[PDB]
Amino acid sequence: MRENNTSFLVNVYDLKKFDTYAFNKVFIDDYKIFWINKGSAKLVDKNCLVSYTITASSVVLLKKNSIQRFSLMSLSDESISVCVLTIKNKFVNSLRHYLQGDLMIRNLYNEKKDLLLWNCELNDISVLGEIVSTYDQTQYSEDFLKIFFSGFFSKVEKKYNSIFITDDLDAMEKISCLVKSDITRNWRWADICGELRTNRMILKKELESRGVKFRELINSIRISYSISLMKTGEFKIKQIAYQSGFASVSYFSTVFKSTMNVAPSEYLFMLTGVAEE
Ligand SMILES: CCCCCC/C=C\CCCCCCCC(=O)O
């Protein structure tokens, strides 16, 4: 029996005609890129107060460890499919140490942009479409894709003077890794700074730049954790809530609905296509 893909996750979601998805403080737990298959949609980035029209030749890149606030609204008179490619941590590591030589200008890039737009050449459209076409690819060696994505992320970074793939000494990565190492623990802000051996200073900068309080950040990480659990095959809402560190199903559901603008059971239906029972 062939095995699940170790480098990527592919999830496709139906965007009904003229409907809107709205995300409020969603934590991006891994690097993600997404695109629509046909038609057009309006993307409103509420972090930057910038609006974009995307088409089938656009790809939107979401930075790991960012907190996103945006909406996506279908502009088409037909159902649209949103394809979300998650790049897994094992694979991103390979990318950090792949590109030959030292890129001299990258030290003067900045980290201000967490949502990036790229208008694809058909080269890119071909490769991305084949990746998501079927669970295995086979015709795409892992090395081919490592070369492709390191070159792909390189040119997006150069369009924006911005670091997309960060080093793993990043303070926000250390925080989110620590929280997820014990997701049901009642984390306190002073405990995290203590265990990371970094005072409540450079760490506070990470909350401020994302516009969240500590308790908001923990809730956002826990929602992203619950979505990861649902993707593993866990479909019992009580188990999803408790394993993600929520005190009750009621509160999980309220936070989930505030973050994703749909109820947990609705998201489960979008994910699996199976209505309950
Ligand atoms: C938060 C990233 C979603 C980007 C794509 C938005 C398009 C359709 C909304 C359905 C997806 C809802 C969140 C998906 C969760 C995930 O796959 O990580």
Side-chain angles (χ1 to χ4, degrees):
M1 199 169 195
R2 72 74 189 140
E3 312 174 330
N4 296 350
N5 191 297
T6 309
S7 296
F8 311 99
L9 184 44
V10 173
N11 298 100
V12 185
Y13 300 101
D14 292 328
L15 171 58
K16 263 84 149 75
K17 46 171 55 89
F18 313 121
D19 218 327
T20 304
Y21 289 121
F23 306 98
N24 175 227
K25 297 193 291 294
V26 54
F27 181 76
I28 305 299
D29 189 32
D30 275 303
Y31 291 97
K32 290 177 192 276
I33 70 176
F34 71 85
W35 61 96
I36 61 169
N37 67 326
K38 69 164 113 178
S40 66
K42 177 177 190 199
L43 185 55
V44 177
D45 184 356
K46 288 162 181 145
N47 280 337
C48 310
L49 273 168
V50 179
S51 84
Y52 313 92
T53 302
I54 62 170
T55 70
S57 76
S58 314
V59 302
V60 179
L61 290 89
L62 302 176
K63 193 195 239 294
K64 190 183 186 192
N65 293 327
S66 62
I67 289 283
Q68 304 279 342
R69 299 167 180 84
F70 72 89
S71 58
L72 187 64
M73 178 186 61
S74 154
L75 297 169
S76 299
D77 196 24
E78 63 205 330
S79 210
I80 285 176
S81 295
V82 185
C83 187
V84 181
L85 177 60
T86 299
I87 303 194
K88 298 207 224 159
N89 187 46
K90 185 214 77 132
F91 187 86
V92 177
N93 261 311
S94 298
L95 307 186
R96 274 197 220 92
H97 305 108
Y98 221 85
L99 294 138
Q100 264 273 38
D102 172 54
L103 187 286
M104 334 205 293
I105 208 153
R106 202 169 188 262
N107 306 26
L108 256 48
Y109 289 2
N110 61 80
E111 291 225 32
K112 297 208 92 155
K113 291 273 183 62
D114 293 340
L115 188 153
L116 302 181
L117 254 292
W118 180 256
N119 292 304
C120 281
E121 311 152 21
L122 168 76
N123 296 346
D124 304 333
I125 298 161
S126 316
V127 170
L128 288 176
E130 264 285 287
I131 283 172
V132 308
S133 72
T134 317
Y135 297 163
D136 299 306
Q137 306 123 31
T138 299
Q139 325 214 290
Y140 285 75
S141 67
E142 186 212 7
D143 278 68
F144 176 91
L145 285 182
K146 289 186 292 198
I147 301 159
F148 173 82
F149 276 110
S150 50
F152 186 78
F153 294 140
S154 277
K155 44 194 205 184
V156 182
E157 287 188 342
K158 301 207 212 312
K159 172 174 196 250
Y160 288 100
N161 284 357
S162 99
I163 296 306
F164 185 67
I165 308 280
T166 52
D167 54 62
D168 39 62
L169 185 66
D170 175 77
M172 192 66 242
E173 172 71 6
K174 302 162 117 43
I175 291 167
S176 76
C177 280
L178 210 218
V179 169
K180 291 184 276 105
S181 85
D182 201 1
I183 195 76
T184 65
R185 169 165 171 182
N186 199 11
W187 294 104
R188 257 150 252 277
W189 178 241
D191 298 339
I192 278 156
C193 298
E195 313 221 11
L196 297 190
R197 301 153 299 102
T198 325
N199 163 281
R200 340 185 302 274
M201 27 167 285
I202 289 283
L203 302 194
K204 171 200 213 90
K205 198 196 165 106
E206 305 299 329
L207 306 172
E208 304 188 309
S209 66
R210 292 166 177 82
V212 293
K213 299 289 199 187
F214 178 64
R215 73 103 57 64
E216 286 177 314
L217 169 70
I218 293 293
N219 270 355
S220 292
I221 293 171
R222 286 185 172 148
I223 294 295
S224 90
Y225 195 98
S226 74
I227 286 168
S228 291
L229 285 182
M230 290 183 257
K231 287 177 179 191
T232 70
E234 175 62 79
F235 303 146
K236 180 162 195 176
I237 295 283
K238 284 189 188 289
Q239 286 303 313
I240 295 148
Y242 305 155
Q243 289 181 29
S244 301
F246 285 97
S248 68
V249 171
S250 292
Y251 184 59
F252 165 60
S253 295
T254 295
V255 175
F256 194 97
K257 168 73 166 150
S258 174
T259 304
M260 311 294 296
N261 278 271
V262 298
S265 65
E266 164 129 13
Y267 172 74
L268 267 177
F269 174 73
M270 295 166 42
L271 178 65
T272 66
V274 62
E276 215 191 308
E277 147 73 25

